[model samples]
Target: TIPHLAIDPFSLDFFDDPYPDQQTLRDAGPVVYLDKWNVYGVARYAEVHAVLNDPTTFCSSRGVGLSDFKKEKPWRPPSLILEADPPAHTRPRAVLSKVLSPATMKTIRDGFAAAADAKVDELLQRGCIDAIADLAEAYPLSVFPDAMGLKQEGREHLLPYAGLVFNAFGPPNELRQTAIERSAPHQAYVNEQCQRPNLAPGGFGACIHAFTDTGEITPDEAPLLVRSLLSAGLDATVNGIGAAVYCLARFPGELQRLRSDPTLARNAFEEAVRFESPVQTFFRTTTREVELGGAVIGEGEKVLMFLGSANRDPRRWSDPDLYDITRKTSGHVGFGSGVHMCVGQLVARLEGEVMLSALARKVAAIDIDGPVKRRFNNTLRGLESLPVKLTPA
Candidate 1:
C-alpha cells in the first residue's frame, strides 16, 4: 500500500538530476512515499543520519536495494558487512578492520603515493588530458590491484566491471544487463583470483580468506566479502577523482592552496565529497513503528537515506550549494555514518589526497576545457569525462 508521490523514485527523470527533487522531498517533510517503489524516503540531513545510525530500529537485513533479499533474487550475494546489522556484522567487520588498520594502511602509503605522484608529474607535462581516464583510473587501478593481490594481466577490465556491479545493485534494467554482459567473462577470472593459491599472503584478498580459515567468517562467505571490497572500491573513486579535479580546476585558488600546503589534500577530498558526494544514496528499513517530521512511519517498511542531499543541505552548511575546500566538514555523511560507515574511508581519502597532492607537485595551474557531463545512475553521482588543461612547472 504505497501512497502517490509528487515524484516517482525509479523514474528516468529522477536520475537525470535529483537535487531539485531532493529539495522538494526534503521540504515536503521527513517521509515522502514513493509509489513507484513502495518505499518511503527521508531527505533531510538530520533525519537521514538518524536512520543510517540507528540500524537496530531501521533493519538493513531485508536488503538495502529495492528488491527485498528474502523475497527475490539478489544481484549478488548479500554483503557480509554492508548488508548485515550488528552481532552478525560485528565479527567480519572487526576482522577486516584490523587487517586494514592505520599502521597497515600507513606502511603502504609512501610507495603508493610515490607511484601516483609520478603519474601526476607525467600527466602535467602533457598540459591537457581527460582527468578521469588517464590520471584518476590509472592511479588506483594501478595501486589497488597489487594491494588486493589480484593480478589479471593489465587489469583493464576493473572500472567497467565495478561500474556494472554498482549499477546492478539497482534495478535489472538495461544498465544492469549491459554491465552483466560486459563483466561475464571477467567474473570467472575475478572469482578464480580470490582463491588461496592466487591470493598473496599479506594483501586484502588474502586477509579475507585467512579470516575464514580462522573462523572469523565462513569459508563460503570469504569470496563475497572480498568481492564486496572490489565492488565498492573501484569506479566510484575514479568518478570522485574526476569530480575533485573538476572542482579545483574550476577554482584555481584551491589548487594554489594545495600547491603551497600539500596537507590540504584531505580537506580538498572532504570538500569534494561534501560538494559532489560520490556515492549518492543508500536505503534502510524501519524496524518498528516510529514518527518523524509529523508523519507516522509504520513498522516493517523501507526508507531511502539521501547522503548526497544531506551533504548539501542549506540548514547545515553556510551557502551549502557552494564548493569550498577550506570548509570544516566534520560530520559530512560522504563516507556515511553509524556501525556501517565505510571502514576503508581513510584508504579512499588517502587515495584522493595522494592523487591531488601528487598532481599538485607537478602542476602550477590546472584548468578546465569543454563542458563536463554527468553520468546517469540510481546511486553514485559523477562525471563521465573531465576534460582539463594541465600545465606543469
Candidate 2:
C-alpha cells in the first residue's frame, strides 16, 4: 500500500524548515502520496534518480509545478528548455548544452577569476561581511551580467526576476502571489535584455543569437533559451554559494582542509551543494501508468522529486548528513541527473570555484559573526543574510 501524507509544502512554516518533513516523506516509503496537493512524492535517492532517468515515462512537458499546463493556463509561457519534454525539448537542450558547455566555462575562466578575486579582497578589507548579501550575491551580480551581456542600468532586476521564476515552480501560495503582483518592472527589464540589441557583441547572450545565425535556434526561440539561462541557474548559483559559505562558517574543520589545499575549493562547493541542495524540489507528471517502488501512479498525476532528500539519503551515502567537503560527490543529485540535469551548472561551478578559491587564498577563516536570516522561497533554499567575521591570511 502507498503511504499518504497531508502536508502543504508551500506553506510559510514548511519553507522555513523543510528537512524534517522531507525525512518523514522519505521514510514513509519509496513513493509517498502527498494528499494535500494530490501528488505523489519520491524522496529517497534511488526512486528520485529512477524518476529523473525515465523522463519519457515521467514527463515534464505538462508542467514542472502542481498546476498542469494541460489543465489550466500557466502564469507565463512554458520554458522552451525547462518545461518542454522531448521532440520539443530536444533542440533547445542541444543548443543550450552547446552554448553553456565546459568549453564556454574555460573561455570565461580568467575573467570570472579576476572578478571573484576583486570581490574577495574588498570583503577582506571590510573586516567582516555578510556572506549572502556581500559576497555570494554580490560576486554573481558583478560578473554574470557582463558574461550574459546584460545592460549596466537595470542589472538589479535579474535577481527578483530569477526569484519569481523559481517560486513559480511551486503552487500559487502567498509567496507566488506576492511575487506575481510585484514583478512587473523586473519582467520588463529581463524581457528587454533577452533581445539581441541589448546583448553585448561577444557575450553568452549573443552566443545564443549566433545560434540563430547558424540555424540551431529560431530568432524568437533564442530569447526563451536566454530566459532559461536567467531563470534556471542564477538563483541556484546564488543559493549554492550561500550554502558553501554557510557550511564553512559552521564546520571550521572543512575550512581548514580547504585552506590546506586551495584546489579543494571546487570540491568544497560540490559538497555544499550536496549537503544543502539549493533547488529543493521539482514536479514531474506521469505520461502513463508506472510502478514506482510498488505503487501504480496513474497518468497525468504529478510526482514531486525531492532533490534535497535524495542528496542526503542514508542509503546513498555513508553518514549522509555529514558535510565533509573532501568526500566524493560524483553521484549527488544536487545539480540533478540524466538528461534534464541543470543547464547552468557550468556557470555555477565557475563562480563557485573561483570565489571559494579566492577566499581560501586570502582569508583565514569565516567566523559566524551575527544572526543569519533564511530567505524563504517555494523552491530555492538559501539565506537572506549571513554575517561572517573574516580572518585575513
Candidate 3:
C-alpha cells in the first residue's frame, strides 16, 4: 500500500521529488484538504491556475503567508502591488507594468545577449568552469541592477537581498532564519537605493519615480512599487538562466538540436521552466465555501498553488515528466497564467534565450563533474553547485 503522504510544508519528502506526492493528491481530487497541515492544496494544473488568476474568487488580500498579513506579526511592509488585489492593486501594477513591458526589454536585449556571450567565452578559455557561478550569476549580476538604475556602489547586496525576499515566502524555519541573518545589513541598503533621487536615469526604478511625478501613483507608494520590480527581477532570472544550462548539459541531444538552429533558445528556456519551475509555489486564499473533486474547502482558507507540480501534470501534457526543448510550451504556467502572471516574463525570456543561445554557439558540450546537489528552500528552486567540464567546439 502507498504510505499515507504527509503534506507538511517543511517535510523533506515534499522537497525531494514532490511530483509523486503531487500526482497522488491531484489524482485524489481537484482540491486536497491536507489534514496534516490543516490547509487546502490545489493539485490539479487547471484548478491551481484558475485559483491564482481569478483573484475575485481566491483573493490575496489576507496575504498568502501563513503568518497572517492581517495581523502583520511578521512585519512585512506589504508589497505595493503583489499583496493587494483589483482596484487597490491596479495602479501600482499599471505603473510598473509600463516599465517592464516588451518594448523596454527591446532596448536591453542585444546588450544582455552580448554580455552572456562574452561571459561564456571567458569561461571556455579556462577549460573547466563551475557553470552556475561562472556563467549564470555572471550575466544577471552584470546587467539587472544597472538596468534597474542602481549605482555601482554597494550593489553587491542585490543577491543576498533577493535570497531573503524569496525565503520569507516560507515558514520561519532554519532556512528563513539563515537568509534573514545574511540579508539584514544589505536590506537597508537596497531599500535606501529604492528611495527617490537615489536612482539613475534609464533604470526601471527611476522610471517608477517618473510615474509618481506624473501623478500615476502617490509619492509614498513609488519606492514600494520599485521594490516589487526589483524582487521580481532578481534570482528568478538568475536561476532560470542557470537551470537552462544545467538541463542542456545533462541532455546532449537537446543541446545539439539548439546549436543546429541557434534560434531555439527562447523555446528551450520555456521548456526549462516547464521542466523545473524556478518559483515553486505561491498562495491564494479561498473567499467562500467551494467544492472541488471530493474536497470541501471552507472560506478564509489559504490554498497553495504548486506551479512546479502543475507544469508536470500528466493530464495536461504528453509525458509531462519528460523535458523536450523543441516542444511548444508557450501556454505553460511556468511564468504563470492570467492577470497576475509574471509581468517581467519577456525580459526573463529574453535573458534566457540570448544567454543559452550564446552558450550553444560557444560550448560543444557541458559534462557533469559530479552529482548535482540542489539547494532546497520553500520558495525558490536552484542549484547549490553545478561543477562541470566545458568542452569547446
Candidate 4:
C-alpha cells in the first residue's frame, strides 16, 4: 500500500511555513496518499518531473484541483486550455502558442521594456515602498491591462479575480469562501472585458477575438478563450514579480551579482521563480491504474504535485534552499514541465527580464525595510506587503 499521511497541505499554517511539512511529505515516500484530502502527492523532484511530463497517464482534463470537475460542478466554466487534455486542448493550445511565440513577442518587447524602465524610474523616486503593492501589483496592473487593450476603468478587479480563480483550486475552505464572496463583481467585470466589443483593437484580447474570423474557434468560444488568457496571465505574473523582488531583497549577494552582469536578468527571474515558486501546487488525476515509484495508483485518483517542493528537492539541485542566481535552473518546474506547462511563461519571462534588467542597471541594492507579510492563497505563494528599500547604484 502507498504510504498514508494525514497532513493538510491547504491549511493556513501550512501555507505560512510549508518547508518542514514539504520535507515530511517528501521523506515519507515518492508517492504518499494524503488521507485528509484523499489525494496522492508527489514531492520528490524525479517523481514530480515525471508526472508532469507523462500527462497521458496523469491527465489534467478532469480538473487541476482538489474537486474533480467530472463529478462536481466547476465554480466557473473550465479553462479551455489549463483544464483540458489532448485533442480538446490541441487547437486552443496551438492558437495560444502561435499568439505567444517568440516572433510575436518581439512585437511587444520594446514596448514592455520601455514600460519596465518607466515603472522603475518611478519606484526609484520613492526609494522605499511596499514591493508587493507598489512594484509587483502596480507594474503588472499597469502594463498587462494596456497590453490586452482593457479599459483603464474597473482594471483593479484583475488581481482579485486572479486570486479567486487560483484559490478555488483547493478544498472549499475559508480561503475559497472569501475569494468567492469577494470575486463576484470583479469576475463579472473580467467576463465583460472578455467580450469582443469591450476589447481595444491591436491588443491580445482583440487578437484572441480575431480567431473567430478564421474559424479557429467559434464566436461562442472566443470569450472563454479570452478568459483563459486573463486567468493565465494576471496573478501568476504579479506573484512572479513579487517573488523576484523578495528574492533580491533577501539575497544581496545575488542582487549584486545581477547588478554586475545585467544580462542575468532573465536568469535572475527564472532563478527567483525556482527559489519561490509562484504557483505552489497543481493537481492531476490518474486516467487509469498506473504504476509510479513501485505503487499502483487507481484511475480517477487525484494526484497533487507539490511543484514548490519538487523545485527545492535536494536531489534536483545543489543547496536547493539557497537563492543563487548562478544556479542552472533550466529544468525547474517553477513554470512547470511538458505540454500543459504554463502557456504565458514567455510573457512572464519577458516581464521579469525587463523589470529586473532595468532595476539591475539603476538599483544598487535591495533590502527589507520592515516586516514582510505573506499573502495566503490556496494555490499561489506570494507577498501581501513586502516593505523594501532600494539603494540606487
Worst ten-residue run, lDDT, model 4?
95-104
Off by over 4 Å in 3: 1-5, 72-74, 181-183
lDDT of 2 by residue, 38-135 (tens): 89999999999999999899888888888889998887788887888888888888888888888889888999999999999999999788899899
- Report every candidate's CA lDDT: 0.78, 0.88, 0.79, 0.89
**Which 10 consecutive positions of candidate 3 have the poorest summed lDDT?**
1-10
Writing each residue's lDDT as its tens digit, candidate 4 over 233-336 gives 97998899999999998888898999999999999999999989999999998999888998789999999999999999987789998998888999999898
| Residue 15 of model 3, lDDT score | 74
Q: What is the TM-score of each candidate against the true structure?
A: 0.93, 0.98, 0.94, 0.98
Which candidate has the top score in lDDT?
Answer: 4
Clashing pairs in 2: none
Runs in model 2 deviating more than 4 A are none
lDDT of 3 by residue, 214-298 (tens): 7679888988888787677878987887789888887889989888888888899999988888888888777787665545667
Give the Å shift of residue 256 in candidate 1: 2.1
Q: What's model 2's overall lDDT?
A: 0.88
Off by over 4 Å in 4: none
